[PDB]
Amino acid sequence: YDPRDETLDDWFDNDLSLFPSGFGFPRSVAVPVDILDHDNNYELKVVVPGVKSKKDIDIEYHQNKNQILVSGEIPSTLNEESKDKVKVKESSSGKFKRVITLPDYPGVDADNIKADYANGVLTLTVPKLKPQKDGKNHVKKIEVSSQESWGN
Amino acid sequence: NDLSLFPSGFGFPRSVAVPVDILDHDNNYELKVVVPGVKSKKDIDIEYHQNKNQILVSGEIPSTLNEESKDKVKVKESSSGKFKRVITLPDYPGVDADNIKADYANGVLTLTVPKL
Amino acid sequence: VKKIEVSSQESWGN
Amino acid sequence: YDPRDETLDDWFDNDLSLFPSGFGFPRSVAVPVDILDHDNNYELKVVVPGVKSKKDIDIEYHQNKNQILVSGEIPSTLNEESKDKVKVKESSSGKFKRVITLPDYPGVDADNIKADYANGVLTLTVPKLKPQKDGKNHVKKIEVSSQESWGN
Amino acid sequence: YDPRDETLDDWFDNDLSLFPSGFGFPRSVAVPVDILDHDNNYELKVVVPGVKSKKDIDIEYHQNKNQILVSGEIPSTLNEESKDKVKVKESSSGKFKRVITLPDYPGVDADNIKADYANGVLTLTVPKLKPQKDGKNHVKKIEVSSQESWGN
């Protein structure tokens, strides 16, 4: 993936999931998403960045892009008497956008899309009735023959 | 306007950089740290010093492993590990050291140090 | 047709 | 090569258990050190490769620094008539000292120090039967409510 | 020289100065070992780095290869809840294994070896009856051709 550091640290017992390559997800503010791949359902958990609201986060799907579009506003403060700071490093943006292309393979279903907000994290449980065929190769032709028990 | 304008005339020494916002409202010391997706509020300890009279917070956001409900393809995952918030309060005796309350809600940890 | 979601609340802890 | 998990595992192929922590540390001139922490009693083990009698080691408490005076010497095998000094290698540490720095708050005991000698291992337990300088001892009060069961 | 160990090594001139022969039997966990060579006994002090155990360390002789074998584990610390590691660095390898090719001449009888552990050091004394004939030569030969001083 990367030259050294971020290729090897992707396995279990301290952070990450296996991550060879990757395609860009257009967004403001970069925060990971877990994809639980199944053919009976599909998971999208978008870690919302400590937003106290959740009713100002609009979740919608483009059937014109095949992408899940979630937008929201990151908390911000304005200089006031009853606000007085000693330290500040709060975010670096006041608005957050994620544009997510699903690598779920042709057979997408999201028009039945349902959402939940759990633990300060937006979780979208995406119904799937497809694909069971017609992925990369039209009608799956996975290894099922070897002319023996496994071949030797 | 995502942080705010604040000239440096105060500062409390600290290690590890995470999004923070010290807030002083009435007479309390309050801090908003971005810690979302932390399962249980007992994975973050909020310890108030009885030998310094100061707040001290540490936490850890659960770390992603290799999963049997996820097929690994090209999907990134990340979290922040162990971290410590070293906040010093030169607020002096006259502050209640037994009435500190922390409010972890919506992925936002809100602290209150009364000073009733 | 454009679809929207509006799932919110559940602010009682878990 | 840089798996923080395997880095810590490689550290823990030298002691075979769970996880480390951080406390103290200032020292000048390296000697064997094993810093293990109980409830508030702290443990120090300095390996000796055998020593002639137990009168070659002194244990006291620094009354002017709030430190612990641990000092010893292990004699060298010398004037051997059994076999000439032309083959074999022997090394035994000379005059070593250990300066133990504890920023552990007032309530340390300087008379209840116990040093145990057995199996050629220096065993040191420093009480610490009172961590706090406050009236309540061993008490740090934490969060008790948050108006939600966890947070979401 | 300038190092303490080096000037100590130079101070082992008690009938000749001691410096490395140019060989040393396999070592895991660097700790020296002492041999005293004789044909009436062979005295071997395996310097042990402070093992708490004394039933888990094994001593065996191989009469087929004529190698004395001593091996065991270094007992490492644990992290539990009344054991909380900070930093430690003893027990660099958990397994130590001692093979020695005896340079005490053939005729050694190490089936009469005695083992005892005390002070933090393993002490092994191998009593000898042979060598005294049928050792390196069958009935020893000493050159007695000498004198003839009167000029020529």
Author numbering:
A (entry chain I), D (entry chain B), E (entry chain A): 63 to 214
B (entry chain J): 76 to 191
C (entry chain X): 201 to 214
How does the study describe this entry?
Hsp26 is a small heat shock protein (sHsp) from S. cerevisiae. Its chaperone activity is activated by oligomer dissociation at heat shock temperatures. Hsp26 contains 9 phosphorylation sites in different structural elements. Our analysis of phospho-mimetic mutations shows that phosphorylation activates Hsp26 at permissive temperatures.
Compared to the previous analysis, the new structure revealed that the predominant species of Hsp26 is an oligomer comprising 40 monomers arranged in a raspberry-like shape both for the recombinantly produced proteins and the authentic protein from yeast. We could resolve the structure of the ACD, the CTR, and parts of the MD. Our pseudo-atomic model of Hsp26 consists of residues 63–214 (71% of the sequence). Our structural analysis revealed that the ACDs in Hsp26 adopt the non-metazoan association mode, as the loop containing the β6 sheet can be clearly seen in the density maps and fitting of the wheat ACD domain was possible. These dimers are the principal building blocks of the 40mer. Surprisingly, a β-strand of the MD extends the β-sheet of the ACD and then a helix leads further into the core of the structure. Thus, the MD is intimately connected to the ACD and three MDs associate with each other. While the CTRs exhibit some flexibility, their density is always visible even in asymmetric reconstructions indicating that the IEV motif is predominantly bound to the β4/β8 grove of the adjacent dimer. Based on the 3D structure and the crosslinking data, we suggest an auto-inhibitory locked state in the inactive oligomer where the MD is locked to the loop between the β5 and the β7 strand of the ACD.
